[PDB]
């Protein structure tokens, strides 16, 4: 629909750097993603189809 499209457009027009990770891609990965964001101050992070990791919480089994 253009969710990534408009984000990319904003990244191009503004001085920002555009870093992207899809939710299907543990916590160390998130740490590295935010750290790599920190290396460029105006840089943008994007999570694509995040819901898989952000699904409603409850008692986890395995």
């Amino acid at each position: 629909c253009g969710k990534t499209m408009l984000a990319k457009a904003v990244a191009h027009h503004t001085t920002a750097a555009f870093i992207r990770v899809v939710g299907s891609e543990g916590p160390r990965m998130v740490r590295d993603v935010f750290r790599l964001a920190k290396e460029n101050a105006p840089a943008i992070i994007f999570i694509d189809e995040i819901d898989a990791i952000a699904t409603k919480r409850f008692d986890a089994q395995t």
């Binding site: 409850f58 008692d59 986890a60 089994q61």
Partner: protein, 230 residues
């Protein structure tokens, strides 16, 4: 998580599978039930996915007895099962006592049924939530029975898609002194407010309990309230 089985608790003491059943609820078609001063109005959406489906051939509002009406928000077949069970239970109450079953007694019996489907390791609960409208001893009753086996008393409520919108709407636009006609107007208004897409005779169906008798409004009457009104 603790959802592939129904007969085991979670460490937080949560029956997870039944809340998955409740999540199946409110994903179905919207429905709203309001108790007026006199009557009890239950409205539900009946849009056909295509012109193929015959709107006059199927119904969702069902009279369990000539003074009890049932509406639901869930997959159809489980609702059919519980309608069959409720009709037989009301008839057996009539046989036992020679009295027409009051609203609360039928509601608690159906709640006990939905309860008995909440145990064991090879079954699942009904994924349907129910509004029961009834007349008992001159008093109008509206009840909600939900897959957990519990039931609640409501002067007004709604569930289905956009159900929180229904809660807000009936919180704002409601008073218990409503006349019957204004009550049906409120019912169609909240149905539309939760609704997406056009609404006519073929798209909505409603059922009204009055102390003399309960009846499901014809599509023409559902249009008369639905169109040229509101």
């Amino acid at each position: 998580g603790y959802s592939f089985s129904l007969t085991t608790f979670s460490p937080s003491g949560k029956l997870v599978q039944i809340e998955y059943a409740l999540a199946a609820v409110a994903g179905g078609a919207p429905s709203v039930g309001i108790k007026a001063a006199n009557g009890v109005v239950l409205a539900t959406e009946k849009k056909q996915k295509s012109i193929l489906y015959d709107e006059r051939s199927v119904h969702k509002v069902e009279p369990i007895t000539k003074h009890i009406g049932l509406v639901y928000s869930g997959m159809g077949p489980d609702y059919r099962v519980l309608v069959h069970r409720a009709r037989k239970l009301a008839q057996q109450y009539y046989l036992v006592y020679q009295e027409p079953i009051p609203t609360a007694q039928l509601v608690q019996r159906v709640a006990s049924v939905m309860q008995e489907y909440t145990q064991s390791g090879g079954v699942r609960p009904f994924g349907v939530s129910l509004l029961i409208c009834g007349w008992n001893e001159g008093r109008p009753y509206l009840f909600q029975s939900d897959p957990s086996g519990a039931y609640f008393a409501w002067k007004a409520t709604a569930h289905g898609k956009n159900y929180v919108n229904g809660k807000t709407f009936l919180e704002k636009r409601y008073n218990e002194d409503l006349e019957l006609e204004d009550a049906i107007h409120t019912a169609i208004l909240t149905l539309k407010e939760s609704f997406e897409g056009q609404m006519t005779e073929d798209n909505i169906e409603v059922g009204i309990c009055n102390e003399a008798g309960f009846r499901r409004l014809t599509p023409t009457e559902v249009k008369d309230y639905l169109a040229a009104i509101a």
